[PDB]
Enzyme design. Sequence first.
Site, mmCIF file in Angstrom:
data_model
loop_
_atom_site.group_PDB
_atom_site.id
_atom_site.type_symbol
_atom_site.label_atom_id
_atom_site.label_comp_id
_atom_site.label_asym_id
_atom_site.label_seq_id
_atom_site.Cartn_x
_atom_site.Cartn_y
_atom_site.Cartn_z
ATOM 1 N N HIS C 207 0.805 -1.201 0.000
ATOM 2 C CA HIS C 207 0.000 0.000 0.000
ATOM 3 C C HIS C 207 0.845 1.261 0.000
ATOM 4 O O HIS C 207 0.310 2.347 -0.234
ATOM 5 C CB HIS C 207 -0.933 -0.046 1.200
ATOM 6 C CG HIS C 207 -1.933 1.057 1.243
ATOM 7 N ND1 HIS C 207 -1.673 2.275 1.828
ATOM 8 C CD2 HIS C 207 -3.204 1.122 0.788
ATOM 9 C CE1 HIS C 207 -2.738 3.046 1.725
ATOM 10 N NE2 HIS C 207 -3.681 2.370 1.096
ATOM 11 N N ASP C 211 -2.500 2.394 -4.178
ATOM 12 C CA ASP C 211 -3.784 2.749 -3.621
ATOM 13 C C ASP C 211 -4.800 1.672 -3.971
ATOM 14 O O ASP C 211 -4.647 0.934 -4.942
ATOM 15 C CB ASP C 211 -4.225 4.112 -4.149
ATOM 16 C CG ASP C 211 -5.461 4.647 -3.447
ATOM 17 O OD1 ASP C 211 -5.345 5.087 -2.282
ATOM 18 O OD2 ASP C 211 -6.549 4.637 -4.062
#
Lengths: 236, 236, 236, 213
Positions: C207, C211
């Site tokens: 992450h 996204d």
Amino acid sequence: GLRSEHREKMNRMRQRIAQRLKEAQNTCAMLTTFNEIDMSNIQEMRARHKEAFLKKHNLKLGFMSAFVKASAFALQEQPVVNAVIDDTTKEVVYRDYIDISVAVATPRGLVVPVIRNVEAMNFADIERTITELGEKARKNELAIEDMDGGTFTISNGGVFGSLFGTPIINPPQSAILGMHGIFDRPVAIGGKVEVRPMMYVALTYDHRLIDGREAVTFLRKIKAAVEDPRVLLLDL
Amino acid sequence: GLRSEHREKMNRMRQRIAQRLKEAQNTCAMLTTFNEIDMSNIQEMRARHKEAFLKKHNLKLGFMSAFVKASAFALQEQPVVNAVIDDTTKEVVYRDYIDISVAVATPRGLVVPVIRNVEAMNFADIERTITELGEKARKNELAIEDMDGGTFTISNGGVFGSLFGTPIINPPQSAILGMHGIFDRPVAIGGKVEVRPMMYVALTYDHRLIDGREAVTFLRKIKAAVEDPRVLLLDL
Amino acid sequence: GLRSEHREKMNRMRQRIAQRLKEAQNTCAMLTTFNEIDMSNIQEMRARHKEAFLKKHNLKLGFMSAFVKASAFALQEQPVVNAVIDDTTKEVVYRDYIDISVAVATPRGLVVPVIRNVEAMNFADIERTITELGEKARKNELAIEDMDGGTFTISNGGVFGSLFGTPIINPPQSAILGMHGIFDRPVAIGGKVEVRPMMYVALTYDHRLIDGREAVTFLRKIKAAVEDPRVLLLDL
Amino acid sequence: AQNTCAMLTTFNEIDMSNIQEMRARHKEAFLKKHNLKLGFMSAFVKASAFALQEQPVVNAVIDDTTKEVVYRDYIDISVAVATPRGLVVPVIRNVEAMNFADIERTITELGEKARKNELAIEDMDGGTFTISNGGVFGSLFGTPIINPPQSAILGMHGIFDRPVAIGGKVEVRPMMYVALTYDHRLIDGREAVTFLRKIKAAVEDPRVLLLDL
């Protein structure tokens, strides 16, 4: 917002968990696999042999001692998930025995007491032990040695109605099962649809020790030993 | 393969996330629980009272301000998931207020602005606030204080069509909800099958602060306050 | 219990995994998203063009080279999940090529060999490569350079029958797909119920780099390129 | 009241089905949490605050000493509870700042206080709006009376399964006629039909009360 935030200090044993938790993570390599279990064949086992189990043993028949016994069937055939990794020395610690650590939820929170030597126990001496410990949990006399140890662990977060989720290891162990609710959900049996009471079931596991082969398969034994408990006699 | 790998440097604010992310992990004890929500009773609420909500408030009626209000119903009855853990001092910080932090997706990525003091707000002053901030997101004027703070957070990764998934805390908080798509899926209502629009819903949570009792139950309130929003008046 | 716990020492390459694993975690920001895939339209592709694929290529037609090709369709349109983050320097490393790393399970455990330059490959030169490597796996001659590298990775934990689960990155990469079984499960197609063979499919992802927009959408391409493989010609 | 007011009366009917199931499902949960009995009455108190905040006239009154309206930001509804010695009308003060269960906390606090004759004056004093349940006794409909100083009074008149048309076809539904007396010096019929249609929609679909519609 409103500067009305009141605080309270962490007494040691309440934050001490947070410390001895974050050496589960940062030690383990926690992952998680899931399957679903059609519990229909074992609810009828609790519709038929409930009274007979009561008038003989004066114990309440639950759908939980199956997951304790099935988790000894499988846990004796895959000794890795019974094992652990030592940290002082880098060396596995296999075990011939199993002393499962069951979780019972309580007003003051949660305790995890042990059922020692399940391999040498039947499917009713377990329920003798749970009820012996549920009673012992309500009155706060549950000793340390009763909670000490463990090679495997079962969490029933289904009494509260979770669908599924990610359990946490409560070390020293190498895995933890997790039972997640019985919801009548639609099912395909033979190319046609139907409703069956069904449970998602989770197995966290340390991937240092456990390949996914060793954990999917482990959890399919638990899945077959509970859709058809007759497997447990076959020693399959 | 082809040595054609072009690189680009990380400017600070793009990597700064990665730093202030990995103190969510390595601080928290992130876990994740799931349930499913039959959204049928609230879509009809958007089939019937849509125009009336428009000709009165000139606001668009969404299925999201329910999860903001239900997440205040529950978040006021379980103040732990409103709380946090201080790291400087080891001490919980409970809060009487709630200033939910909603996530809105954008071209340049994702922002998370706040809806402050939802406890003192109705189910239409929320949508007044979201639309006030969605507009403010498209033009990059969204200030810091509007994003600063937060006690709870909601992510809608369902506009993009996820089935379910594991959210991440965007600290300082102690949990984050997550909405994951509306897919007409088969359902059992009364021992018979049927199709219903349904959403899986996820609650990451810090397990230092939150026992699974405190998080399954939290997420069943959100589950009942959205299958039957009438619960929110009962203060149940 | 019984003090009968026998131990064995960790030889280096068996614990070395544990070390180079825990720099996947503690480096990455691993999350996980899921969807489900109706595999019916591609099983018939293996019911009809199986023999023709055999009498021409003498190769076995699998439902796996789709996930390799679909994972190049999408992985060329979202180059982030092809990319990585350098740690020495904080700088992304994008890549024009893709050299997917497939996992094949073995007696001695699991290996992950590479299919280099899938972008310049068809849907049968892949299966030429897998069978070239499955054979190479059974006899332990699989070299290092064949396993070295990788930008993306696919794990089939469905041969063993998992329903779903959380894969792990086997760095240096930035994601890993995961295929989880084909179970005839009830499905709603057009407000009516039916049974379809279906697979849950998982995408772990860093992450820091990715996204959730960049990962849900990535996994919906893989989801559409496998319910209707005709998409792969459209370059959609 | 008469000879001061200009009492009129308008009626509508309410299909109470959607709120009886709310008392079939959330009855026990309301009990094991609040230890209060769930009634179909706190809706008419809350709906009568939804509407009574959007039409402040029927919250208002007319002063007689001076000829001047007295609008009010607050509402202190006056509920009627029937008794052996007759009828009393005690107040639920500040309903705008109350939920749909703190009301029932107040009613039960006052029903008990009614049986033993300790109900004080200040508890009955005041009022801006009033609700009469003449349906416990089984009236079909009727004309209430203002119990001044107020400017209106609602009236609930029985739940009788009566035939209904929903979609060009007939059916049976539990239904209530509902009456709003009103002073016509202060209240045009627009201000009173509409008032009573809010109360009619906020009780066939209580979800309206969250929308602040």
